[PDB]
Write a protein that binds this ligand. Structure first.
Ligand SMILES: NC(=O)C1=CN([C@@H]2O[C@H](COP(=O)(O)OP(=O)(O)OC[C@H]3O[C@@H](n4cnc5c(N)ncnc54)[C@H](OP(=O)(O)O)[C@@H]3O)[C@@H](O)[C@H]2O)C=CC1
Ligand SMILES: CCCCCCCCCCCCCC(=O)SCCNC(=O)CCNC(=O)[C@@H](O)C(C)(C)COP(=O)(O)O
Ligand code: SF4
Ligand code: SF4
Ligand SMILES: [Zn+2]
Lengths: 370, 176, 96, 126, 114, 111, 208, 287, 48, 95
């Protein structure tokens, strides 16, 4: 939900001021007055459509500062749910672009598929959407027996349903007429205006954070990111759908390459222990108690990292006193970076095309706030 | 590795160009879309009759915020303030006193249903499993006064059932 | 599903995708609930006789950041990283 | 680029937007926070906390809570030196009370003095 | 001590820009009180404008005066557009009490406000 | 060529001599720059290395696979922007010694 | 030390060290710190006069391209006279590397408005002006974006508390919404979590 | 008196103020504004209604969380009224329809309603009971309205004698009756001198008098600042609004001052004129 | 509970009249099930 | 098992019942003050005081990793039963 003050020569434009900050909540200030483990759900819900990659980026920020590597089964399970989150955010961006452009029904088709995916999140943790579930120190409370075969079933049926989505749309004649001529992006614009991810895929330069700097076990699966040629919105749509299909590939190879290691790290001074040793130990009870009261101490320094949210460069910049409270967190948001160049993206079009421009860069308007 | 799109040309052969002209002047793949949508018409739709059929769930749903108690025993809570120490919107409010017996207990144990984001941290933080996220999710409350639970409301809500809560925990006390 | 053959043929004629096969109404491969209770593994710790916490103290491995020039004939002008090699079209059906 | 600059004071209180009631009425206090006496560790030292004085907290007449009409009641500003503390307090306008730092006094104790011969420092128990 | 000011050399340009900004606010008021369908006489609004100007007359530092001029120019732009609604314009006014005087005994009845 | 992978950038027909007159203008504007700093040394060294790459190669695709900056015309645009920094760095004197120091209790982090 | 602790590459550390030494040698007029952390992300700490010259150098020169612009923030650090820290973040399209241009600044003296060479910095600079008050001379349009219009205080400072000073409510007296001094319904409790006992011996500052 | 009736801190939004007010009516006009100003003061208001809960729903969120409370009353039984006034600091009586109904006249609402509520009030032990009345309601002719109000005035004066009998003039505001009838015209022209008083000064006076003790026993009357002709006021209404039997007789009947009883000046509130608020409220004309 | 429907139409309740006494032939609420049937009906299990 | 104060309503298992001069009683009008009708102190005399032949004995809580953690309590008080702070159930010694 936004405010837009546009100044237009008739059925065309001149300029547009996006008044944003309607959905400001003070997230950085609230994290500055809390601990790490307590203020993880703020990172979970600053973006809300993508929901576990934000967990992934914050957990990898804390693990990268804390110099502790998770066990490998935690890494592969984190890769699986990152692919679920990638699939989910791209399919919701496609369907909300379709609903805002018109196109009533494929919205509901792919949201039935997303209802299966929220059933999967429920069976994993219990929450519908905002499952925290990713502690810094690896994934907590692993999956119940009888989930991977359901994901296998969803992979087959969803390959069929996404091929039926490209059966319906994509060589739709008037949707192609609706979004081809709009949304040109120069490579100099894509550099200077600070774009992130899907805009960089769509306009020119081959660029993936996952491929260039593999922050996890993404380096050991064969996939190929789609690139754009003309720097165009229909072309960007094709890029999103083929990134979904690459996510199907990575899910298949992840299910075939799963090692049965362990849930969390074996460093009980960071991750809490489990119930058996908790009810009969002494060191594990002490670690449970003080780890949930104070929060583990984090060495001083300022770090930055960034992973590939389905929007783009989800960056997180931590600044830590030697403490259990972070001194200053800050979030590089691809929604903010994409909204930053709206005048130069929409200097020569009309208002329905502007609504299509707001659609063709995936928006949540929560993450754009920081 | 990359697999890009939109690298072709319209074929200059006569058959392909007259097929594109036939689609242009004959409205063909539009009717193909109509055929696909009628194929979904002749399916049976997947709906649930809501007041009679309730949608499926997991044994680890997070709902009601109920309490538990000992087998034929007293209140399971100690007032050890871990849930208010972890509560990420601080909706827990604990004021504790011991009674005339000697075991440490409470005075005031309040959950704000407005602030409760329903994490599960107070369930995971409870050392004795006193507070448990409940099974049912039907609050639907006409007044804002009534959405502020007291400890006695929580005890009545934990004594309207335990057998559901006990069955869910006894099924899944091994994962967590 | 659960329907006669003429309207099935009309569905497959309006969309030739064999809709009766996979229809997004799950019947058989719902995960059979009340699974047997799992026994979790414990990973590369609880290993007795060797787990000195002195070794794997990743919190205490945080070095302070090293410093170069301050407020208090050189073979140089290198890049921060080696320059990035251009990728390849993946063989799995690129365009074109 | 080597412009006007004049050596004077600072008046940020006409910019930071907090109203003048809270400017001239509320009073700051700068102190090193004392060691919480039950533990004996002084990592909680070495910082100069700036706080504001407390004000009224009545009873919330429906739940038994402590509401307040004080937005500034939960400020704290942990600093590193007294000079920058006083400079910031005078820069942002309001008044301030300076309490001075108190280290633990160094002593002179020894186990042999706890085992004296004709001095009265004697352990008497062990 | 090197300090780079914004616009100022002495307070003459400060006086010049603030009197031009007040002229802009004078020709700003009637158009807005006609446009937003407001409910306040023009005399009262102009007197509250000049009262808000006369509140911060105690500043001699020229950088602060420059930053005040820039803030007033920003809000004059945002009110000469239709970007700010009726709520913010009434929020400049105080027609909802807020009754609190500065008497000693009045603050002694409703106590703990020294 | 034929319709390169970039968008707002159509292929050029004479890459070689255009690139060579670009780098000789780089050498000229570097000849404007004073001597004793090593900025001249690093720019002169990298420009002579790249010119030695291009003078020894009349190819196209081997010239892309050897000379970095794929594919081809990004090297031309990057040469234009390198000339842009050259023109902007006749002025502004980046090699001269420092302007005054911070108060030196600022860049140490942990407060 | 090897399982579950992230290994590193000294090669990238040596590359960034040599590159930062190179940049420090060839722009001596404004370089104060070139620091490299353990995981090889470069930081360059800069006086607030070489903003435009250093960014015009770092956009170009064919040894450090860095077209991609990211975050701008000015991390509010008291116990200093130069409080605010303007943090440019730059990413190279050609070289895949991240440099953090941290220039320092005070409350009232402007840095030189990087929007002249960076077209992505426009709403970034407008955001920093709205949330802090860091003025930007030679800028096209400075407004309040991501705040309310009638609200002031520059709220992301440390002097601004958690709750706002004003709080809206509708009232039927004057038939509209008015702002009042804040009347919280609960305290926002404050947990003294800063535990003692020196969790990191390497980052000890020398006491007095 | 017990705690949590004493004032606490500043005012507004569940700051515990002094009075706990049982209000009869409050679904109409003046009672709604009075609940509004007590919610600005931060006072708990116990109001019973008799109608659908939708009306008390669209006047519900005036208070803070759970401050005001809703219950039921009826014009027949003492049990429901007594249950509504079991525990009350102050109580105000505002009631009356300006046309006779099937089950109620002008008689026995103005007569029978203050009798039973004053009975259970004086047996209950309430303080600072404020009873409204129309101005110049006499034993004299032309209105069953005014004569039944005079009978109710004599009742509230006689039993429970230290009631604040209060009277404004005929008030105008956002939901006025007579200015609405001035808008809902067609015509006829008469003469009557008349002073109009705006509604917010009236309800500010009522809340100040109910929160300020020692001002009890005396009946009060509120004064319009202009006091001129009715027909000139109708010309003023048509001029500002851009366009060229019981209610009309009760506005043509009587409008005078009374030098006996004290008004605005013993309360310390500024009077808003007719002209300012009339320009504020005369919207909804042609463009 | 029927098997031939899809997952979402297996388990449906039919409410009765005045189990608490509020004429619930019509206007059927939710949460009129005992909690073990609230486990069964929300598809958290496969056994009655 | 509840008292009835002269206010006239249900008391709780905490000494918080009202005075006559209160308005919170009259905001309880129309909706019942729901309270747990199964108190806590009365479910202590219902539990039998167990007698264990050992000296320094155990308390777990009826279930491995289901309840309160282990605590070992002493029985040196010859006439006073050992009391777990978590459980609330007693123990004795039989030599
Ligand atoms: N200019 C004026 O209008 C002036 C008016 N007054 C007096 O002020 C009072 C309020 O005026 P106003 O708001 O305009 O009129 P209303 O009719 O709206 O106010 C009367 C209130 O009591 C209720 N009520 C009235 N009769 C009954 C009944 N028989 N049974 C139950 N409830 C009843 C009304 O409706 P409901 O039942 O739906 O709650 C309403 O809530 C009146 O008594 C009027 O005489 C005094 C001076 C000037
Ligand atoms: C509806 C109403 C519309 C809104 C009403 C409120 C508007 C708020 C506007 C706020 C603008 C201000 O308050 S800026 C005030 C500037 N005050 C100053 O003192 C600036 C410095 N100037 C001076 O000191 C002098 O110029 C003097 C003394 C003010 C004038 O001297 P002249 O005589 O040489
Ligand atoms: S964590 Fe459990 S036992 Fe402790 S105070 Fe909370 S509910 Fe009670
Ligand atoms: S689930 Fe609710 S009560 Fe529990 S910690 Fe979260 S917000 Fe607090
Ligand atoms: Zn026990």
């Amino acid at each position: 939900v936004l405010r837009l003050v546009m100044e237009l020569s008739g059925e065309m434009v001149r300029k547009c001021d996006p008044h944003i900050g309607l959905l400001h909540r003070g997230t950085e200030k609230l994290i500055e007055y809390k601990t790490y483990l307590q203020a993880l759900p703020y990172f979970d819900r600053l973006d809300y459509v993508s929901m576990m990659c934000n967990e992934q980026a914050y957990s990898l920020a804390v693990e990268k500062l804390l110099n502790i590597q998770p066990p490998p089964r935690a890494q592969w399970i984190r890769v699986l749910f990152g692919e679920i989150t990638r699939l989910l955010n791209h399919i919701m961006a496609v369907t909300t672009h379709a609903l805002d452009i018109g196109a009533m029904t494929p919205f509901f088709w792919m949201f039935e598929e997303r209802e299966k995916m929220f059933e999967f999140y429920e069976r994993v943790s219990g929450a519908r959407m905002h499952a925290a579930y990713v502690r810094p120190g690896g994934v907590h409370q692993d999956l119940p027996l009888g989930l991977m075969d359901d994901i296998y079933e969803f992979s087959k049926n969803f390959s069929l349903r996404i091929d039926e989505l490209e059966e319906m749309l994509t060589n739709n004649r008037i949707w192609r007429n609706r979004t081809v001529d709009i949304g040109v992006v120069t490579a100099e614009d894509a550099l200077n205006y600070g774009f992130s991810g899907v805009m960089l895929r769509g306009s020119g330069i081959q660029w993936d954070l996952r491929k260039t700097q593999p922050y996890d076990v993404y380096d050991q699966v064969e996939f190929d990111v789609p690139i754009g040629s003309r720097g165009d919105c229909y072309d960007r749509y094709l890029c999103r759908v083929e990134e979904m299909r690459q996510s199907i590939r990575i899910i298949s190879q992840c299910l075939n390459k799963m090692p049965p290691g362990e849930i969390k790290v074996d460093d009980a001074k960071v991750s809490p222990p489990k119930r058996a040793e908790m009810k009969t130990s002494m060191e594990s009870l002490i670690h449970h108690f003080k780890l949930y009261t104070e929060g583990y101490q984090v060495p001083p320094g300022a770090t930055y990292t960034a992973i590939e949210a389905p929007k783009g460069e989800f960056g997180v910049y931590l600044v830590s006193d030697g403490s259990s409270r972070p001194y200053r967190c800050k979030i590089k948001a691809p929604g903010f970076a994409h909204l930053a160049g709206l005048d130069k993206m929409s200097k020569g079009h009309m208002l329905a095309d502007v609504v299509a421009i707001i659609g063709t860069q995936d928006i949540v308007f929560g993450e754009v706030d920081r | 590795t990359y697999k890009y799109v939109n690298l072709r040309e319209p074929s200059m052969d006569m058959k392909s160009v007259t097929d594109r002209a036939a689609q242009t002047l004959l409205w063909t793949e539009l009717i193909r879309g109509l055929g696909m949508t009628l194929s979904y018409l002749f399916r049976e739709p997947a709906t649930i009759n809501y007041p009679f059929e309730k949608g499926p769930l997991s044994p680890r749903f997070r709902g009601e915020h109920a309490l538990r108690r000992y087998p034929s025993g007293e209140e399971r809570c100690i007032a050890c303030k871990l849930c208010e120490a972890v509560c990420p919107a601080q909706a827990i409010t604990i004021e504790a006193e011991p009674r005339a017996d000697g075991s440490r207990r409470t005075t005031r144990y309040d959950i704000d249903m407005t602030k409760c984001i329903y994490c599960g941290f107070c369930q995971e933080a409870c050392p004795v499993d006193a507070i448990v996220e409940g099974p049912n999710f039907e609050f639907s409350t006409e007044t804002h006064e009534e959405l502020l639970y007291n400890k006695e409301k929580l005890l009545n809500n934990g004594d309207k059932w335990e057998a559901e809560i006990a069955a869910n925990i006894q099924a899944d006390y091994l994962y967590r | 599903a659960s329907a006669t053959r003429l309207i099935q043929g009309l569905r497959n004629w309006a969309s030739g995708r064999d809709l009766q096969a996979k229809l997004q109404l799950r019947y058989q491969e719902i995960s059979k609930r009340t699974q047997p209770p799992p026994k979790l593994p414990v990973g590369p710790s609880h290993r007795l006789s060797n787990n000195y916490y002195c070794a794997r103290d990743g919190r205490r491995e945080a070095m302070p950041p090293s410093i170069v020039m301050s407020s208090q004939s050189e073979k140089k002008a290198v890049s921060p990283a080696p320059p990035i090699k251009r990728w390849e079209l993946s063989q799995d059906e690129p365009y074109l | 680029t080597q412009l006007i600059t004049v050596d004077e004071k600072l008046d940020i209180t006409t910019l930071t937007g907090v109203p003048e009631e809270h400017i001239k009425t509320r009073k700051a206090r700068i102190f090193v926070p004392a060691r919480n006496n039950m533990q004996s560790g002084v990592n909680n030292t070495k910082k100069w906390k700036m706080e504001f004085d407390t004000r009224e907290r009545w009873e919330n007449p429906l739940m038994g809570w402590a509401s307040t009409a004080d937005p500034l009641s939960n400020l704290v500003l942990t600093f590193s030196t007294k000079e920058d503390a006083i400079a910031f307090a005078e820069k942002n306008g309001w008044s301030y009370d300076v309490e001075e730092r108190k280290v633990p006094k160094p002593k002179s104790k020894s186990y042999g003095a706890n085992f004296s011969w004709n001095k009265r420092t004697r352990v008497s128990t062990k | 001590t090197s300090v780079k000011p914004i616009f100022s050399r002495d307070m003459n340009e400060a006086k010049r820009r603030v009197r031009e900004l007040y002229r802009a606010w004078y020709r700003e008021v009637p158009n807005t009180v006609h446009l937003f369908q407001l409910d306040i006489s023009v005399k009262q609004g102009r007197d509250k404008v000049r009262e808000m100007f006369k509140k911060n007359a105690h500043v001699t530092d020229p950088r602060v005066v420059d930053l005040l001029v820039i803030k007033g120019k920003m809000e004059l732009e945002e009110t000469i557009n239709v970007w700010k609604q009726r709520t913010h314009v009434m929020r400049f006014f105080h027609e909802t009490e807020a009754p609190r005087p500065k008497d000693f005994l009045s603050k002694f009845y409703v106590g703990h406000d020294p | 060529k034929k319709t390169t992978g970039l968008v707002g950038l159509a292929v050029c027909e004479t890459p070689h001599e255009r690139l060579k007159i670009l780098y000789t203008k780089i050498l000229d504007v570097l000849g404007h720059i004073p001597k004793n700093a090593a900025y001249r040394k690093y720019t002169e060294q990298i420009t002579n290395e790249k010119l030695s790459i291009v003078k020894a190669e009349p190819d196209v695709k081997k010239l892309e696979e050897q000379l970095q900056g794929g594919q081809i015309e990004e090297v031309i645009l990057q040469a234009e922007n390198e000339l842009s920094l050259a023109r902007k760095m006749i002025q502004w004197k980046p090699w001269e010694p420092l302007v005054e120091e911070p108060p030196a209790s600022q860049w140490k982090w942990p407060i | 030390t090897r399982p579950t602790v992230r290994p590193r590459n000294d090669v990238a550390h040596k590359q960034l060290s040599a590159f930062g030494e190179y940049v420090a040698e060839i722009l001596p007029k404004y370089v104060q710190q070139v620091q490299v952390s353990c995981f090889s992300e470069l930081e360059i700490c800069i006086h607030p006069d070489g903003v435009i010259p250093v960014l015009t150098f770092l956009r170009d020169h064919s040894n450090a391209q860095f077209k991609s612009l990211a975050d701008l923030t000015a991390v509010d650090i008291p116990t200093r006279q130069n409080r605010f820290e303007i943090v440019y973040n730059l990413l190279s399209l050609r070289f895949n590397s991240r440099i953090r241009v941290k220039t320092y600044t005070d409350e009232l003296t402007p840095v030189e408005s990087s929007v002249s060479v960076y077209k992505a910095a426009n709403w970034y600079e407008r955001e920093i002006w709205d949330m802090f008050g860091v003025f930007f001379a030679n800028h096209p349009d400075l407004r309040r974006i991501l705040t309310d219009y009638g609200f002031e205080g520059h709220p992301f400072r440390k002097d601004f508390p958690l709750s706002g000073y004003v709080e809206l409510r509708y009232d039927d007296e004057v038939k509209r919404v008015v702002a009042e001094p804040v009347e919280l319904a609960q305290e926002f409790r404050k947990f003294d979590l800063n535990s003692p006992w020196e969790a990191f011996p390497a980052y000890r500052q020398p006491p007095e | 008196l017990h705690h949590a009736v004493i004032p606490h801190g500043k005012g507004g939004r569940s700051s515990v103020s002094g009075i706990v007010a049982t209000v009869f009516g409050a679904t109409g006009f003046l009672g709604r504004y009075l609940v509004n100003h007590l919610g600005r003061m931060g006072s708990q208001v116990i109001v019973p209604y008799r109608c659908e809960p939708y009306d008390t729903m669209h006047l519900r969120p005036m208070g803070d969380l759970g401050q005001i409370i809703f219950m039921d009353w009826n014009g027949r039984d003492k049990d429901s009224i007594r249950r509504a006034v079991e525990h009350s600091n102050v109580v105000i009586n505002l009631v009356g329809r300006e046309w006779e109904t099937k089950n109620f006249d002008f008689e026995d609402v103005f007569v029978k309603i203050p009798q039973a509520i004053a009975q259970v009030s004086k047996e209950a032990g309430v303080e600072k009971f404020i009873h409204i009345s129309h101005l110049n309601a006499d034993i004299k002719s032309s209105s069953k309205y005014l004569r039944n109000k005079a009978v109710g005035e004599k009742e509230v004066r006689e039993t429970f004698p230290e009631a604040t009998i209060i009277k404004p003039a005929d008030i105008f505001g956002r939901e006025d009756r007579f200015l609405n009838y001035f808008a809902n015209i067609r015509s006829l022209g008469k003469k009557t001198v008349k002073q109009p008083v705006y509604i917010v000064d009236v309800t500010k006076g009522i809340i100040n008098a109910i929160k300020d003790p020692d001002a009890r026993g005396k009946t009060f009357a509120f004064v319009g600042p202009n006091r001129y002709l009715l027909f000139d006021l109708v010309q003023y209404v048509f001029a500002v609004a851009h366009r060229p039997r019981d209610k009309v007789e009760r506005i043509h009947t009587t409008d005078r001052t009374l030098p006996h009883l004290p008004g605005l000046e013993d309360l310390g509130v500024q009077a808003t004129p007719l002209e300012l608020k009339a320009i504020e409220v005369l919207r909804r004309h042609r463009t | 509970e029927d098997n031939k429907q899809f997952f979402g139409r297996h388990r449906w309740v039919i409410y009765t009249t005045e189990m608490n006494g509020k004429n619930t032939f019509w206007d059927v609420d939710g949460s009129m099930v005992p909690p073990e049937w609230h486990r069964w009906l929300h598809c958290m299990t496969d056994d009655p | 098992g509840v008292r009835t104060s002269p206010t006239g309503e249900k008391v709780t298992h905490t000494g918080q019942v009202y005075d006559d001069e209160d308005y919170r009683r009259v905001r309880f009008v129309g909706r019942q003050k729901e309270v747990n009708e199964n108190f806590a102190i009365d479910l202590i005399a219902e539990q039998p005081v167990s007698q264990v032949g050992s000296r320094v004995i155990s308390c777990d809580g009826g279930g491995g990793a289901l309840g309160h953690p282990r605590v070992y309590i002493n029985l040196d008080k010859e006439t006073k039963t050992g009391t777990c702070g978590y459980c609330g159930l007693q123990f004795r010694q039989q030599h």
